Amino acid sequence: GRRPARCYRYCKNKPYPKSRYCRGVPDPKIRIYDMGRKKADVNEFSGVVHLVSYEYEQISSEALEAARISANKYMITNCGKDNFHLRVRIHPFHVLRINKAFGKPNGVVARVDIGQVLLSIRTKENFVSKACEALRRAKYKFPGRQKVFVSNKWGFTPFSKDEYQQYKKKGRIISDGVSCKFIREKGPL
RNA sequence: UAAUAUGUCCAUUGUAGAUUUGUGCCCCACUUUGCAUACAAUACCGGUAAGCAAAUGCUUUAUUGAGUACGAGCAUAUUUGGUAGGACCCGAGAGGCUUUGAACUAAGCGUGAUGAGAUUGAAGUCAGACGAAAGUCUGAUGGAGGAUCGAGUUGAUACUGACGUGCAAAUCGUUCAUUUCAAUCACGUUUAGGGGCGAAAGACUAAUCGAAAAGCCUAUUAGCUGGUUAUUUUCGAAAGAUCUCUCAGGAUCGCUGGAGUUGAUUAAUAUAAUUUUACCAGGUAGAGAUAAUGAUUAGAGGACAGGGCCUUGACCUAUUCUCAAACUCCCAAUAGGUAAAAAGGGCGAAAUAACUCAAUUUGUAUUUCACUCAUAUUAAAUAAAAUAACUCCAAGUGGGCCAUUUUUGGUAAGCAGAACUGGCGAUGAGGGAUGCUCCUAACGCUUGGAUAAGGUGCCUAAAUAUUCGCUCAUGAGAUCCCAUAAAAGGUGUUGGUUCAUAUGAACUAGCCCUGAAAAUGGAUGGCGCUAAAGCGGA
RNA sequence: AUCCGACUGUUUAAUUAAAACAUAGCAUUGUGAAAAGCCACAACUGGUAUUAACACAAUGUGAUUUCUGCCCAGUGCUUUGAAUGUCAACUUGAUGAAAUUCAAUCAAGCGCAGGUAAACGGCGGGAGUAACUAUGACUCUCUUAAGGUAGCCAAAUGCCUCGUCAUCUAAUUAGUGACGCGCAUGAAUGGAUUAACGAGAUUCCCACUGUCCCUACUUGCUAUCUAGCGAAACCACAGCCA
RNA sequence: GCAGAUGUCCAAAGACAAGCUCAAAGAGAACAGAAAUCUCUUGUAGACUAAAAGGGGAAAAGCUUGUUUGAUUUCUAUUU
RNA sequence: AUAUAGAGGUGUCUGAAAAGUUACCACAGGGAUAACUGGCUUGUGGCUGCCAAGCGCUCCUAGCGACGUAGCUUUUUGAUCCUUCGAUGUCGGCUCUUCCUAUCAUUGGGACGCAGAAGUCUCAAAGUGUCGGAUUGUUCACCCGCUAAUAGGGAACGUGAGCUGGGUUUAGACCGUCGUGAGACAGGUUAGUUUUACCCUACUGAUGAAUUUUAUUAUAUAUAUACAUAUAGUAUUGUGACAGUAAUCCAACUUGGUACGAGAGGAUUAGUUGGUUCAGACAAUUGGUACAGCAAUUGGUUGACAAACCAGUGUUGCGAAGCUAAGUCUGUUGGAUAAUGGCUGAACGCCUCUUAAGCCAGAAACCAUGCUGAUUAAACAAUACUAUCU
RNA sequence: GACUCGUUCAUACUACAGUGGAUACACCAGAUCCCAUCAGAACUCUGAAGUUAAGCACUGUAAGGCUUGGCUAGUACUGAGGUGGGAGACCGCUCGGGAACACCAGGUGAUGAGUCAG
Numbered sequence A: 001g002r003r004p005a006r007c008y009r010y011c012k013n014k015p016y017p018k019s020r021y022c023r024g025v026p027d028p029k030i031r032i033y034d035m036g037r038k039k040a041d042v043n044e045f046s047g048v049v050h051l052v053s054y055e056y057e058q059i060s061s062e063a064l065e066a067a068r069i070s071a072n073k074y075m076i077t078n079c080g081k082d083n084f085h086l087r088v089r090i091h092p093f094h095v096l097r098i099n100k101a102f103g104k105p106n107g108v109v110a111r112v113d114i115g116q117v118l119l120s121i122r123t124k125e126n127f128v129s130k131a132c133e134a135l136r137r138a139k140y141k142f143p144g145r146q147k148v149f150v151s152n153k154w155g156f157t158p159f160s161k162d163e164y165q166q167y168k169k170k171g172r173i174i175s176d177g178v179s180c181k182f183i184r185e186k187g188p189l
Numbered sequence B: 001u002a003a004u005a006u007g008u009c010c011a012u013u014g015u016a017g018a019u020u021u022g023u024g025c026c027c028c029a030c031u032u033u034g035c036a037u038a039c040a041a042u043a044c045c046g047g048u049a050a051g052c053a054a055a056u057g058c059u060u061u062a063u064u065g066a067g068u069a070c071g072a073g074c075a076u077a078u079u080u081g082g083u084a085g086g087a088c089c090c091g092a093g094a095g096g097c098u099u100u101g102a103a104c105u106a107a108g109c110g111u112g113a114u115g116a117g118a119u120u121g122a123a124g125u126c127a128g129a130c131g132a133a134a135g136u137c138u139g140a141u142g143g144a145g146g147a148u149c150g151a152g153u154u155g156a157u158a159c160u161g162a163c164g165u166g167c168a169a170a171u172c173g174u175u176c177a178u179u180u181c182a183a184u185c186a187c188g189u190u191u192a193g194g195g196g197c198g199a200a201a202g203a204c205u206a207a208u209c210g211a212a213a214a215g216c217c218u219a220u221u222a223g224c225u226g227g228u229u230a231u232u233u234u235c236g237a238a239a240g241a242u243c244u245c246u247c248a249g250g251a252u253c254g255c256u257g258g259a260g261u262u263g264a265u266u267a268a269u270a271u272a273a274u275u276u277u278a279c280c281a282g283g284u285a286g287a288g289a290u291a292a293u294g295a296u297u298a299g300a301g302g303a304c305a306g307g308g309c310c311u312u313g314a315c316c317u318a319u320u321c322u323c324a325a326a327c328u329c330c331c332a333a334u335a336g337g338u339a340a341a342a343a344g345g346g347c348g349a350a351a352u353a354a355c356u357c358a359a360u361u362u363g364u365a366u367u368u369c370a371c372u373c374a375u376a377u378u379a380a381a382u383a384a385a386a387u388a389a390c391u392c393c394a395a396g397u398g399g400g401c402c403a404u405u406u407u408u409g410g411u412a413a414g415c416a417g418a419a420c421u422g423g424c425g426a427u428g429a430g431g432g433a434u435g436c437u438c439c440u441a442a443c444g445c446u447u448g449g450a451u452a453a454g455g456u457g458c459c460u461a462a463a464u465a466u467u468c469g470c471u472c473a474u475g476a477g478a479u480c481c482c483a484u485a486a487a488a489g490g491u492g493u494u495g496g497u498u499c500a501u502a503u504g505a506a507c508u509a510g511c512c513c514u515g516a517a518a519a520u521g522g523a524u525g526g527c528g529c530u531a532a533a534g535c536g537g538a
Numbered sequence C: 001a002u003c004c005g006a007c008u009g010u011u012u013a014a015u016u017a018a019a020a021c022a023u024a025g026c027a028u029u030g031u032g033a034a035a036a037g038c039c040a041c042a043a044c045u046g047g048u049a050u051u052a053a054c055a056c057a058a059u060g061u062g063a064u065u066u067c068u069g070c071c072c073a074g075u076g077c078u079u080u081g082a083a084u085g086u087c088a089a090c091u092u093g094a095u096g097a098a099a100u101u102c103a104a105u106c107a108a109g110c111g112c113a114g115g116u117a118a119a120c121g122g123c124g125g126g127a128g129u130a131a132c133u134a135u136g137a138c139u140c141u142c143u144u145a146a147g148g149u150a151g152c153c154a155a156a157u158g159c160c161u162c163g164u165c166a167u168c169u170a171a172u173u174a175g176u177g178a179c180g181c182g183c184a185u186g187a188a189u190g191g192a193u194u195a196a197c198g199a200g201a202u203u204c205c206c207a208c209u210g211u212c213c214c215u216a217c218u219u220g221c222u223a224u225c226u227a228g229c230g231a232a233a234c235c236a237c238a239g240c241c242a
Numbered sequence D: 001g002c003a004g005a006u007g008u009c010c011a012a013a014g015a016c017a018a019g020c021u022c023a024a025a026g027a028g029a030a031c032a033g034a035a036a037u038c039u040c041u042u043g044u045a046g047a048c049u050a051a052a053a054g055g056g057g058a059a060a061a062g063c064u065u066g067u068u069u070g071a072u073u074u075c076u077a078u079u080u
Numbered sequence E: 001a002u003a004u005a006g007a008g009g010u011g012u013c014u015g016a017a018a019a020g021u022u023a024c025c026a027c028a029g030g031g032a033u034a035a036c037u038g039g040c041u042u043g044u045g046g047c048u049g050c051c052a053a054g055c056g057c058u059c060c061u062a063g064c065g066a067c068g069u070a071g072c073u074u075u076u077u078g079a080u081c082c083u084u085c086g087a088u089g090u091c092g093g094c095u096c097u098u099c100c101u102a103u104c105a106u107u108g109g110g111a112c113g114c115a116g117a118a119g120u121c122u123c124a125a126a127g128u129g130u131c132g133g134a135u136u137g138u139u140c141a142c143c144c145g146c147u148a149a150u151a152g153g154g155a156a157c158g159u160g161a162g163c164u165g166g167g168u169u170u171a172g173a174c175c176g177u178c179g180u181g182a183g184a185c186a187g188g189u190u191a192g193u194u195u196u197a198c199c200c201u202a203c204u205g206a207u208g209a210a211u212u213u214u215a216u217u218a219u220a221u222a223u224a225u226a227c228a229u230a231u232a233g234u235a236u237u238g239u240g241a242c243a244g245u246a247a248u249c250c251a252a253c254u255u256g257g258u259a260c261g262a263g264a265g266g267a268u269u270a271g272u273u274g275g276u277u278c279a280g281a282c283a284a285u286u287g288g289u290a291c292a293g294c295a296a297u298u299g300g301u302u303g304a305c306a307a308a309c310c311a312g313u314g315u316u317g318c319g320a321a322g323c324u325a326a327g328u329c330u331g332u333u334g335g336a337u338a339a340u341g342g343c344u345g346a347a348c349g350c351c352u353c354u355u356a357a358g359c360c361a362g363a364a365a366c367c368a369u370g371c372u373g374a375u376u377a378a379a380c381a382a383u384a385c386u387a388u389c390u
Numbered sequence F: 001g002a003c004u005c006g007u008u009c010a011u012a013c014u015a016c017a018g019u020g021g022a023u024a025c026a027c028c029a030g031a032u033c034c035c036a037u038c039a040g041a042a043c044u045c046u047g048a049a050g051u052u053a054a055g056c057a058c059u060g061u062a063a064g065g066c067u068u069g070g071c072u073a074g075u076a077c078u079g080a081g082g083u084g085g086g087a088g089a090c091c092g093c094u095c096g097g098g099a100a101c102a103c104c105a106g107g108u109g110a111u112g113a114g115u116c117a118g
């Protein structure tokens, strides 16, 4: 069925992805990535919490999926299903391989860096503690060393809260869905 | 067929080059000569092209030869090497050739012998009994049988008994199978080695058998194993590579020694695992995905298909999340190449040519003259740079392994496979308790000194030094490789950070505790150590 | 009671005594003779053979009982040959100045056409289908030289497997009797069955016992000590551990 | 180790020249439809180039046409 | 025939013209290379965590624990090929000892989805124990039964100069499949030599010298003295450092049909009597044993009777004594603790088992007591006499 | 002012606009001949009636692109050293070297030879 997961912890082997030279690779267990009110505006949620791994590791896709599930369920238990936005900001492309000689492809892995974020929760400023808790719970399921990190950003958008507010006040920013575009003074009239 | 070719006894032309000759006794800066040799260039000889072609073959053109251009060889002594031989020594299994054996054993034959004693009781025979008939029974006798049991004999079933440096290179004990027949034994005799003999086990053929023994061919051959003999000194490797019926070998390169030569000895030019100043060449690390390929998660904003103006879609547009060893707009570090001037370069003349051009001189290249280029700081440093080149002759080696870093396969491996460098191997010494590779440092023999790595409680030479913290452990901790520990905890203590109203939080990181279980007894190396002799410093 | 061999016999001298070999019986094949068969020998000659088809030689199977199915495409063996493809020397002819080069020819052998399995051997797969379901007499289909027949079986033949049901036991991966789409049974590779026999292989029952519970005592001979005599293998040096 | 490929194919798919521009998309035109042909617009190649894959290639190295055999003989310097 | 240039081909592609088998094998070698241990690794197996979606009537966590994740172990099988091919005897059983703990039972505890009983989870605990059988060569497995329980392991997958040799893995042979065949089988079946201790060490016992750079826990008449005592030889009695250790579990009944429970059921703890296993003895008694000894008797032999003898101890019967089990007897309790429960009591004005300082009760565990040795201490003391002693 | 041959080969491109045509370019007019096709569309030839409408030149766009520079950022990465840390994964320090995307701002050409018109 599966291996102890400690076999595919460290980033040994160069990134081996799904392409013309892999072919027979099973589907990743994680498919949703982002859930809980995914169609919300940028102005809807202000509190953004990240799950930053301080480990150069691989992270099974299945593990990631499990973590996501944990995050979701906890959120549901806590507040409304439409009061948060869960984003998995790491995708598994590096397909592992097993030998039963060159091994045959078996499952994918979501290899990470020392600085990059795993899970990101965009919620209202009221439910930040809950979000943090959820993140922590999720972490219990990843390998290595992770850390819950509340951001000064507005939510997924690369602007500080105050800055965002300022922008809104002078109308230099247009909100689409989750992501927002900043008017740069560049295009034609 | 056979080496300028009779203009001249002269001895082809260069560029560096020893020695000379002079000028101002080694360097200098010129002249002067130009050994050896290197590097070319020409001639010419043989062949072969090509062009011509009836000659003694001719040619302004090619190529090729182990050629030639004023000979160097021959002989011999020693040497190493390579080859043949017994071939450094010792070692096979075998192959053949000619003999010797059947006293053992195998079978056949000839002549002889040998099998205590019992048991069963076949035919035939005799007597008796019954039946309308056919016929059928009963008691003897008889002594048949590859019948039965069984001493001996011949064997060898079991104890897998004893013995197993025995009594014995197959024995002993008990048990067992065999005993009138395919029996057993003796003597004689026949059959002999790729042969015999075989109720067949490749059995046996003189303790020898899936091809005897003896001698010879033979000192057969072995890329394989073991061995391979005085001392000191000097130099000193490789375990790459290409080919190999090759992967335990060999051949040739590499690396090494010796021999020699040309040089250098003019703190120079040559040159250098080095750097600079120039100039390049890259596409790895990184970075990118709203740059292309391939992926890839979302919604937002928009204008073809389906259902009853709305919904589901796809499609654009602007975005967004994450990516690539076999993606790239870009692109390091490191590594690499050329450059940095006298056998040369400048600007010029005149030459020469069958080349080139439109230009007998348009240029090219060559040659001879000119003028003139830093130089003792030596055309940027620095250089125990000539200990250099080069040539020869050979040896060993061609199983490698380890460490940091980069790295591929592999769950991983003291695993397999690679890259750069260093080691070990070939290497001791001081340290790491102990150790082929870790650190220090490579080694003549001595004295004194001062260190390196590491240490300084004792073992153990050197501090129970000083100085500021941190740790208490009812399985502490103790220094690269290294001899393991983790996720997760901890109202243990010690600092912090962020917050709130001297408390309440949340975190955070040090030490410490839990998590933490394997087999002989037990290992920071031991003893021990807690105001450390622990951990982190100074 | 089961398995194997029928039996008496023989065998690997010194690890295998048997289920191996032999055996009678059965079956096959060749050969009518010194020009035959099978074999030996360098040769000439010889053996069988002082033989003659109830013989000799060569095989296979292995008493009896009961049977030995199907298949000659494959490989063998074998039978007919101027219809016959090929197939050698010689021969013969053509060519040439000749060497040669070419053609042609009734050899066997093979090819062509048969015969042969007690010669070597081999001997199917899928579907569908019967008043509660199952199974499939029966049907279709691809294909083979023939598609394994009578039997027999988890047999010394069964991987799965310690196969399912019985039976033996308190309990049985054993034994026995069944079952059988049998990886991969099977008919002189003989199949199936067998009385008697076996230092054969296997299981159970009764008797019997120190095999064992659970050891004890005892006897000879050794060991032991002495007198006498007196080796060897082995041995780098040696000999405590964590 | 990984993803593959080769033992060939071609009088042209060779040679030279000329002309032309491809894939795709959109908007159009009887039959005509998701593919038939034609036209225009846009078209850095997203086509095609004998085949593996990687280069390279646009008044071409692709496609169309014309003319042809240099897929010729001999010999060097050489690179892998 | 050459010369030159192509072509006919070597795909093992720098280019032999080439099929098998050996379980009948031989030789040279190889740990450059397998099957065995160990070693490295731990994928696999086994064991332990962490998180908590649920399950568990209600309830995340009594017990569980998905999705995940972190380890450890080498009792699995691999991976590996470092060690050994001038041999480390290759499975299993029997036998025997020790070690481990990842404890099945027993002791003490804590938790429960603990009313009692029974049980489940868990902690200190390895002191003591963990069987008889049927089938299989088996390890493993599966039953049957007893049991307090029938826990898991290791020690060169402990243990072949200990054995056994059933299997695997020689030669014989049979069957099935495979191969044209010789033969092959990680298919089945049967028959198939298990050599040597007398060496060193280790262990078990058995003697036994020697021991002055060696000793001394005092001696001597309140004072002395290590600037000191000590001869030796026998012999008795002791000392006892140190080493070894031993006892173990159950049943029945009484407590009690009581506590508890709606009821059915139904105990802890003591106490008593027994037993099991083990150990140490011992033999009155029972049995066992016979080459003390009597008695009988068979065949033979001495002329007979008698007395005997011989038959590897002739064979019986009985058999003292001596050994011996299947027989009999005996097999302690303190100290200090672990788990745990507490106590006083801060940190932290309360609380707090101390997750401070101090205490307390507490286990089949530990150490004593007890028991065995004590040329394990080269030990020593005291007495008794003696050869000269001062 | 314009053209021809060019050089660098986007500051030169593209998209949408605007402005300009003395000479020039260009479009355009015609097909006998050389020629080329399905087609005088192209190509070729012969012209000069018109026109800047396009080509072309020039300019504009809080243009796309490209090109310089800052800024990312001394961040990422990295050469050498370390008995440095960290169980490890990896991460500091010492001597050095040093990116990229994005972002912001500037820029949108220059030029060699010749000829022609005034």
Ligand SMILES: [Mg+2]
Pocket (backbone or CB within 6 Å): A004
């Ligand atoms: Mg596992």
Ligand SMILES: [Mg+2]
Pocket (backbone or CB within 6 Å): A012, A013, B408
């Ligand atoms: Mg790898």
Ligand SMILES: [Mg+2]
Pocket (backbone or CB within 6 Å): B086, B219
């Ligand atoms: Mg010799």
Ligand SMILES: [Mg+2]
Pocket (backbone or CB within 6 Å): B095
């Ligand atoms: Mg030969």
Ligand SMILES: [Mg+2]
Pocket (backbone or CB within 6 Å): none
């Ligand atoms: Mg004889």
Ligand SMILES: [Mg+2]
Pocket (backbone or CB within 6 Å): none
């Ligand atoms: Mg005889």
Ligand SMILES: [Mg+2]
Pocket (backbone or CB within 6 Å): none
């Ligand atoms: Mg025998």
Ligand SMILES: [Mg+2]
Pocket (backbone or CB within 6 Å): B160
């Ligand atoms: Mg014996």
Ligand SMILES: [Mg+2]
Pocket (backbone or CB within 6 Å): none
């Ligand atoms: Mg003996």
Ligand SMILES: [Mg+2]
Pocket (backbone or CB within 6 Å): none
């Ligand atoms: Mg044989």
Ligand SMILES: [Mg+2]
Pocket (backbone or CB within 6 Å): none
């Ligand atoms: Mg020899």
Ligand SMILES: [Mg+2]
Pocket (backbone or CB within 6 Å): none
């Ligand atoms: Mg030297």
Ligand SMILES: [Mg+2]
Pocket (backbone or CB within 6 Å): none
């Ligand atoms: Mg060797």
Ligand SMILES: [Mg+2]
Pocket (backbone or CB within 6 Å): none
């Ligand atoms: Mg990268």
Ligand SMILES: [Mg+2]
Pocket (backbone or CB within 6 Å): none
């Ligand atoms: Mg990235």
Ligand SMILES: [Mg+2]
Pocket (backbone or CB within 6 Å): none
């Ligand atoms: Mg790349």
